[PDB]
């Protein structure tokens, strides 16, 4: 459903999704266009900077994309879009209902293979224009000639011909006369990849059992065969700087390098990408260069470089192994928690189910960096426990950042899944901190908070006990015991004077903080799942179990609004930075905006994925949502920062 | 030469001078349009001078057995289960949850034994209670727990008979003139053995006992014996159900330790041998399926303060046989001493010499050997000392070489005061003086 407050801006934190990317070459530089769901992203291969993002989201997922000099050809559901600088220049509708799923571009021809084994040829109108635009003919690979088309390529110096790689065969079409020139002999196992060699009229085929064939497309024979047992081959690339190496890419995430001249195996990069997300999905040498760009389905794009040889006379036999060079990446699993790091809306902290805490930049995607989990030394000098085989921390339930004393000491306080202590982090250093706050009642951490002096962190355990630690020195200061069931929300005043806790027994406790008294206790009518404290207006909102949002102020301890309308469990909510609205999101696939002055629902968005996190910026710039599927962070901009919206209630 | 000709390139006719890239592949300044096969050859030579022709394409197309097998393989060692016996010098041992972590011990854990069949671990110490833990990986819980008042326990053993394998007794004893026997029934019926049937002067403390199997040798009827180490040189063997004193075996010197070996004879008949060591180093072997008479008397080569003998490689008292046909002869015999020296004898040849030489004398840990236990397969020996911290080694054998990667400097072994091997899982339990059983799993099993 279209909205009237927030309009979609971008989905940040995404680098790849395991569509095989395309490389392109403007002049002597290289760009790398990778698909992220329904948009592509162009990267500058010398530094992996994000040059361009495609202007509109395609109506379905981009499934095959190529790149000549200035133009990028992206094939999604039925049609091929021709894009320059992100902005779409042309759209080629195919005459079928079959999904286009391969394409090549050579000459005046764009050739797009669908999944019903038909091939659509498109021609330029006059050979001076920029992209193939008019329909020319249709080719068909029937079941007699070959299997399913597994690749579609044009190996060089072949005057208007096309190498079609089917699952068992290699056909060669003349795309002007519409003819089938040559059909090879069969192959005893199903071939998955193809790459044209820089040797003349040689293609390289990669099978579903472990072998690379070097087919000579003019003799009709195979030149040589390379066997990699029990490995499905997903990429093939060739080195073109006077060193005849081949790089094969294996769907258990391996990148194997071969010398073709002296028939040895140079090196293997093991676990270069995750097998569970597809292995190495596209690996290609930037040509003339000893650097190879890999990309996998785990939302990661890397570069590896070959240093020059260490022997000053031999060289060709002492090949130094490939080392790592720059890389970009994001979360490999959908994020589980979201926060904004500062009031400027520049960085945002983001934790995922793949057990990593990233810090993503809303201004420039090169500044996105993974917060490191390299632990400090123990304070006394004793040994730290844990496994020797280091793994990442359990996935993050909650976090609370308060950069009042930033750079001074620990700054982020975070709570993990089914473990009884809350770690700290430093956002300035972008690393873990020295302290892990215990709950001291053998209960898991259900909530965290920290004061805006930056001195105090608050832990709320599942046995109902708030413990207040000092963020500088890491020791227990106080411990309140009011609740008996799990404490799901803690917050404190902007003047460190009254704190407010809410547990899932449905009591909101109001404590004085300087004196350790309680000021009161208010029993609601459902267990409370989440609190958000708007700190300037002193109004906090509770997501109750009866699917209402109770807005209650902390000064006079009354329920002052009660917002009804959600049909399932409220996953998240957040206040406007001016504290006028509250945006919630719930498991009925909806996001609502409530004007708590008038107490009604301003806007509603039906979004197909359920939004698990909603956060406003600390200025009124952006909304950041986080959904069930999708490894990134969806970013919306409120149009009411530029116009004024009517606080008049919607329905249906 | 070529496997196809398409008959379209010959009648095509290209221009040349329209674009700057094709403007270079002319051979004259008057050429403007050329034939298709000529044009294909021009840009074939141009492709060949952009990317120069390598040697792997025209060099070769597809006693070399080793080179071929190396060019196909990627791993070069035995894979997972086609090993069946341990690799030396590098263990494979993960750490599980500490077994008594569920219910803490109030004393140093003095003895420790697994069940022969069930997943049960019995711990016990000087706080005069004994605890049984259902062990697994994650959650080692406490089955039951029995606190004998006024009776600190020092040795506790699961006994399970060979006839019906349905008794499941626990024999436990400390520095007392009695020994308790709990009959496992899942109230608790325990009995007390407190009568040496005329032999109370030579047995003033029931601390060092061991439980074993004995055959009648006129019927094929087995029964358990407990064996008590007494003052002078005496071992008092008595029935494990009736408590009747059966026989006694006296060695000459200060009796320090003893172990039980079994050897099969025929179908359904075996023979029990008691192996008892002087402090000085001389070893007696008593046949006790007949009257307790000496059959062999030999001497440990070296060794002057002898604390602990153990056998292994077959059925010991800590790897017990559940069925009488599964009784095996022990291969190895380790005699561990006060200096930390452990002689190791191979009884496949060292039952004949009467001054037999050890296959190796280990010297890796330097203080008094207080535990040494063989893994049930008989491929690891575990030396352990309760005198300094972290004094435990697992020596691989037959190679007689200590594993060098475990334990490390960060293994929380503690002051190792007991150790036990699982009969089936390949699993160490190590109890220290703080009251903690730590638990490890050997991934070879």
């Amino acid at each position: 459903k279209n909205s009237k407050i927030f309009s979609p801006f971008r989905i940040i934190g995404n680098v790849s999704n395991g569509v095989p990317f395309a490389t392109g070459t403007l002049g002597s530089t290289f760009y790398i266009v990778t698909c992220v769901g329904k948009t592509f992203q162009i990267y500058d291969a010398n530094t992996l900077h994000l040059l361009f993002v495609s202007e509109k989201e395609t109506p379905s997922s981009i499934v095959a994309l190529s790149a000549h000099f200035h133009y990028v050809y992206a094939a999604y559901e039925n049609k091929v879009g021709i894009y320059k600088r992100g902005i779409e220049e042309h759209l080629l509708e195919l005459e079928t209902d079959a999904n286009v799923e391969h394409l090549c571009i050579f000459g005046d021809y764009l050739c797009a293979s669908t999944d019903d084994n038909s091939i659509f040829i498109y021609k330029k109108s006059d050979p001076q224009d920029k992209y193939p635009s008019e329909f020319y003919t249709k080719l068909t690979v029937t079941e007699i000639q070959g299997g399913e088309i597994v690749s579609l390529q044009h190996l060089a110096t072949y005057l208007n011909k096309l190498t079609v790689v089917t699952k068992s065969n290699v056909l060669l079409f003349n795309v002007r006369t519409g003819k089938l020139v040559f059909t090879s002999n069969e192959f005893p196992d199903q071939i998955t990849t193809a790459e044209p060699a820089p040797v003349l009229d040689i293609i390289a085929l990669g099978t579903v059992t472990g072998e690379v064939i070097m087919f000579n497309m003019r003799k009709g024979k195979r030149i040589r065969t390379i066997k990699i047992p029990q490995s499905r081959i997903s990429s093939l690339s060739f080195r073109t700087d006077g060193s005849s190496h081949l790089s094969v890419g294996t769907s258990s995430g391996d990148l194997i390098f071969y010398d073709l001249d002296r028939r040895s195996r140079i090196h293997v990069l093991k676990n270069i990408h995750r097998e569970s997300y597809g292995g190495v999905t596209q690996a290609t040498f930037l040509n003339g260069q000893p650097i190879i760009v890999t990309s996998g389905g785990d939302n990661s794009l890397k570069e590896y470089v070959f240093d020059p040889s260490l022997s000053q006379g031999s060289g060709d036999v002492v090949v130094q192994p490939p080392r790592y060079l720059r890389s970009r990446g994001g979360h490999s699993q959908p994020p589980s928690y979201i926060a904004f790091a500062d009031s400027q809306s520049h960085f945002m902290l983001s934790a995922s189910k793949d057990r990593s805490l990233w810090s993503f930049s809303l201004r420039k995607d090169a500044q996105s960096q993974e917060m490191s989990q390299r632990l400090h030394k123990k304070q006394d000098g004793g040994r730290v426990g844990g496994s020797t085989i280091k793994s990442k921390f359990p996935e993050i339930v909650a976090l609370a950042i308060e950069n009042a004393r930033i750079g001074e000491w620990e700054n982020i306080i975070t709570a993990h899944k089914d473990e009884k202590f809350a770690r700290t982090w430093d956002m300035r250093n972008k690393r873990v901190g020295r302290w892990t706050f215990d709950t001291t009642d053998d209960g898991f951490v259900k909530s965290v908070a920290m004061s805006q002096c930056g001195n105090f962190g608050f832990i709320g355990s599942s046995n109902g006990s708030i413990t207040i630690y000092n963020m500088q020195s890491g020791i227990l200061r106080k411990k309140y015991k009011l609740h008996k069931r799990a404490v799901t929300g803690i917050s404190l005043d902007g003047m460190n004077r009254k704190m407010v806790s809410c547990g899932l027994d449905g009591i909101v406790g109001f404590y004085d903080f300087n004196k350790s008294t309680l000021l009161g206790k208010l029993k609601l009518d459902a267990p409370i799942t989440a609190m958000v404290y708007h700190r300037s207006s002193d109004l906090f909102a509770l997501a109750l179990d009866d699917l209402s949002i109770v807005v209650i102020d902390a000064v006079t301890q009354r329920v002052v609004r009660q917002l009804w309308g959600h049909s399932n469990r409220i996953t998240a909510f957040d206040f406007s930075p001016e504290g006028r609205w509250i945006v919630s999101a719930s498991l009925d696939s909806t996001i609502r905006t409530w004007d708590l002055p008038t107490g009604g629902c301003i806007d509603g968005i039906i979004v197909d994925n359920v939004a698990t996190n909603v956060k406003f910026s600390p200025n009124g710039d952006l909304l950041a949502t986080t959904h069930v599927t999708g490894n990134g962070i969806c970013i919306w901009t409120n149009r009411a920062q530029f116009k004024t919206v009517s606080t008049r209630t919607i329905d249906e | 030469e070529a496997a196809w000709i398409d008959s379209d390139d010959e009648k095509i006719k290209v221009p040349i001078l329209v674009t700057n890239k094709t403007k270079k592949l002319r051979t004259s300044y008057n050429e403007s349009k050329i034939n298709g096969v000529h044009y294909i050859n021009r840009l074939r030579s141009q492709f060949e001078k952009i990317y120069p022709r390598p040697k792997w394409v025209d060099d070769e197309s597809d006693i070399n057995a080793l080179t071929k097998i190396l060019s196909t393989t990627y791993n070069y060692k035995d894979t997972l289960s086609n090993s069946k016996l341990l690799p030396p010098k590098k263990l494979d041992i993960v750490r599980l949850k500490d077994a008594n972590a569920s219910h803490p011990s109030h004393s140093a854990i003095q003895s420790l034994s697994f069940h022969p069949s069930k997943p049960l671990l019995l711990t016990g110490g000087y706080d005069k209670t004994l605890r049984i833990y259902h062990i697994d990986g994650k959650t080692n819980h406490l089955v039951t727990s029995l606190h004998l008042v006024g009776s600190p326990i020092q040795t506790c053993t699961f006994y399970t008979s060979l006839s019906n394998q349905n008794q499941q007794n626990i024999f436990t004893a400390g520095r007392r003139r009695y020994m308790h026997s709990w009959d496992l029934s899942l109230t608790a019926k325990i009995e007390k053995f407190s009568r040496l049937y005329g032999h109370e002067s030579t047995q003033r403390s029931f601390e060092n006992f061991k439980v074993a199997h004995l055959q009648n040798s006129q019927t094929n009827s087995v029964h358990g014996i407990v064996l008590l180490q007494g003052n002078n040189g005496w071992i008092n063997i008595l029935h494990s159900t009736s408590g009747l004193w059966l026989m006694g075996c006296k060695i000459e010197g200060v009796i320090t330790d003893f172990c039980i070996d079994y050897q099969p004879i025929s179908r359904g008949k075996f023979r029990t041998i008691l192996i008892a060591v002087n402090a000085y180093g001389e070893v007696w072997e008593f046949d006790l399926n007949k009257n307790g008479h000496v059959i062999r008397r030999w001497k440990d080569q070296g060794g002057v303060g002898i604390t602990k003998i153990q056998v292994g490689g077959g059925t010991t008292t800590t790897c017990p046989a559940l069925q009488i046909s599964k009784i095996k002869q022990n291969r190895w015999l380790a005699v561990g001493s006060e200096s930390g020296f452990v002689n190791l004898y191979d009884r496949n040849n060292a039952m004949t010499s009467s001054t037999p030489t050890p296959v190796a004398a280990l010297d890796q840990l330097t203080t008094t050997i207080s535990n040494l236990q063989f893994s049930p397969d008989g491929q690891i020996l575990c030396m352990a000392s309760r005198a300094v911290k972290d004094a435990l080694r697992l020596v691989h054998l037959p190679s007689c070489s200590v594993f060098s990667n475990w334990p490390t400097s960060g293994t929380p072994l503690g002051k190792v005061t007991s150790v036990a091997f699982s009969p089936s899982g390949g699993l160490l339990a190590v109890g220290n003086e703080q009251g903690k059983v730590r638990l490890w799993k050997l991934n070879h099993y």
Binding site: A45, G107, Y109, H154, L286, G288, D307, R323 | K13, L43
Partner: peptide, 28 residues
Amino acid sequence: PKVVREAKKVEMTEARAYNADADTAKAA
């Protein structure tokens, strides 16, 4: 002293590439 496995600073170079736009011809 062991051998020095230090990495050089890598800069890209100017490479020539065959473009396939000359691999398409029209008939009269």
